[model samples]
Target: RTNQAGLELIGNAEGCRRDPYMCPAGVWTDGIGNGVTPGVRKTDQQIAADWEKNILIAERCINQHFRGKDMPDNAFSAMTSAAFNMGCNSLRTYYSKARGMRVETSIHKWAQKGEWVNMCNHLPDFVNSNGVPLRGLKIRREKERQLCLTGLVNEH
Candidate 1:
C-alpha cells in the first residue's frame, strides 16, 4: 500500500483532509448535479473508503492476472497502485499486451509508454479536453511510476 500511503500524504499535504470526492483535478459535480467541489468540503470516511476500494480492486486485478507468476511483493504493490490509478481495464490491457515480456520489463515499459494517459481520458467525468493531463492526475500517475520503478515498499 505504498501508493496508498503516498496518496494519503499528498491528500493531507494538499489539505484534502481525506475526501475522496475531493477532485484535485478540477471541480467535480456529483451524478445528481450537486456541486461537491474540492477544498469546499472534507469527508475523511469517504476518502478512506475510496482509497481502500481502489487498493482492493488493484490488488485483486494483479492477483488474477499474475497468477502462477513469480512476482515480488513490491511488484504486486506497484501493479496494485497502477490499477488503482488507471483502473482494472487499463491495467489489463497493459498486461495483455505485455504478456510476452518479463514482468519487470513489462512494468518498466509501461512506465515509459505513457499509454495509460489514453485510459485516463476515457473515464467518465474526468476532464481530458486536449492531450494535456490534469495536474492532480499527473501527480498521481507520477507517484505510481515512482513506486513502480523504485519497488521500495519501505520508503513510504
Candidate 2:
C-alpha cells in the first residue's frame, strides 16, 4: 500500500476533478483521473474514497508482479503512480514476444537485479502515448523518476 507521502505525490500529479472529461488519450475520466462512466459527478469525499481504492489496486498489482522483492517506499510509490496512470499489467509487463519467448522489460530486469538507480533512470522512457511522445507524460515521468530515486540518496 502507498503511504501518505506516496499518496500525495500521486494525488498532486493526477489533480482533482468533479466533472467527467475525456483525457488526452480519449478515455473518459474524473475524480483524480479515474476512468468513469460519463456524466457522473462526485463529491470530494467520494472522489477521495475512489482515489484510495485506486491506490490499493495499484499496490496490489505491484505486489503481484514484483513479488518477494522488498522495495523502497518512494520507489514503490513511483511505480504505483505509473500503474495508476497506465494499466497495472501495462506498467508491470512492459514486455514483448520475441521468438516465442517473453523478453523481460529493461526496468524490471534492473529491479530484479536490485539495481534501484537503473530502474529509476528508466522511468523517462515511459513518456509515449500511442507511439507519440507527450510533453505531459515527459514531465510526469521525470517526477516519478525523482521520486523513485529519493531514498537511494539518503539511505546509504
Candidate 3:
C-alpha cells in the first residue's frame, strides 16, 4: 500500500483535471487520469476518491510480484506510482524492441530479486508508449526513479 507522501507525489504528477481529455496514448482521461466518459466533469473530492480506487490496481500488482519481500516504503511507493501511471500488465511485462520479444519489466524483474537499486536505474526505461517516447512519461519515470533510490545503495 502507498503512504500519504506517495499519494501526494502521484497526485502532483497527475494534476487534477475537471474535464475529460485524450491522453497521449489516445485514452479519454480525467480526474487524476482515470478513464472517464467524455463531457463529464469531476469535483476535487470525486477525483480524490477516484485516485484511491485507481491505486488499488497498483497495490494488487505489487503484492503479486513482490510477495514476502522486505521492500522499503519508498521503493514500494515508487513502484506503485509507476504501476499507477502505466497499467499493471504493462508494468509487469512488455515486448522489448531491442530484444524483439516479450520480457518481464524492470519492476517485475527487480521485485523478484529484491534488487531495489537496479529497479531505480531501470525505471527510466518505461517512458515509451506505442513505440514512441513521451515527455510526461519520462518526467514521471525520473521522479519515480529518484524516489525508488531514496536510501538503498550497492557499491560497484
Candidate 4:
C-alpha cells in the first residue's frame, strides 16, 4: 500500500515495544504488535530486527489480504501502519459493536476511488482494545490520520 515510512510511524506509535512487555490483554507483544512468540520476548538488539520483520509482514499482508493497490501513499501509509497492529483481517473489516449497530466503514470503498481524506478518516475506527477503547490507540490512529492527510506537504 504505502511504504516503510508509515510502518516506521507505526513503530513509533503502536506496538512500540523495543523492550519486553505485555499488552493490555496480557498478550506478550512488542514493537511489532504481535508477540515475538506465544509467551516469550525478544531481546532489544533483536527487537529492531523484529520491527523490520513485522513491517515486511504487514506489507505483505496488505498486498495479499487487501485487494487495493489503488490508494495514495499516505492513505496506504496510514492503513499499513494501523494494520500492523490489528492484523490484515481486522484492518480490512474493522468494526465495533460498542455502538450497538454495525456501522459500515468506508475506507476501502473510498480508497478505491482515491479518496484520501475519506479513507484517512476511517483510521479512528480501530482504536479500541477488546471493545472498551484506549487513549493511546486513539492518539496513534490520529497520528496516522495526520500523516496520511499531510504527507505531500511533509514529504514523507
Candidates 1 and 4 compared by TM-score, better number? 4
Location of the lowest summed lDDT over 10 successive residues in candidate 2 = 19-28
Off by over 4 Å in 3: 12-14, 18-49, 97-100, 154-156
Per-residue CA lDDT of candidate 3, range 1-156, in tens? 687666755673146452221121113233433344445555556656666666776777777775413778888888777777776777778887899999987667877898878877788888876566878788878888878788786433
Runs with alpha carbons beyond 4 Å of true place in candidate 2: 12-49, 67-69, 95-102, 154-156
In terms of TM-score, how similar is model 4 to the real structure?
0.63
Alpha carbon lDDT of residue 141, candidate 3?
83
Clashes of 4: 1
In candidate 2, what are the lDDT values of residues 1-156, reduced to their tens digit?
676665655663136453221121113233434344446555556655566567677787676775414788888888777766665555555545455655666776777777778888887877765455778777877888888898787665
lDDT of 4 by residue, 37-71 (tens): 54565454464556656656666665564444655
Task: For each candidate, give its TM-score against the true structure.
Answer: 0.43, 0.67, 0.72, 0.63
Task: Report clash pairs, candidate 4.
Answer: 17-31
Candidate 2, residue 151: lDDT: 70
* Candidate 4 accuracy as lDDT: 0.60
Sort by TM-score, top down from the best: 3, 2, 4, 1
Tens digit of lDDT per residue, candidate 1, span 1-156? 434554553343124444532333222322323244434433555655565555566567666654302344444454555555555554443222446642333433333344333222222222132233466655555554454445333456
Q: Rate the local accuracy (lDDT) of all candidates.
A: 0.43, 0.64, 0.67, 0.60
Lowest summed lDDT window (length 10), candidate 1: 120-129
Q: Model 3 Cα displacement at 121 (Å)? A: 1.4
Clashing pairs in 1: none
What lDDT is reached at residue 73 by model 3? Answer: 84
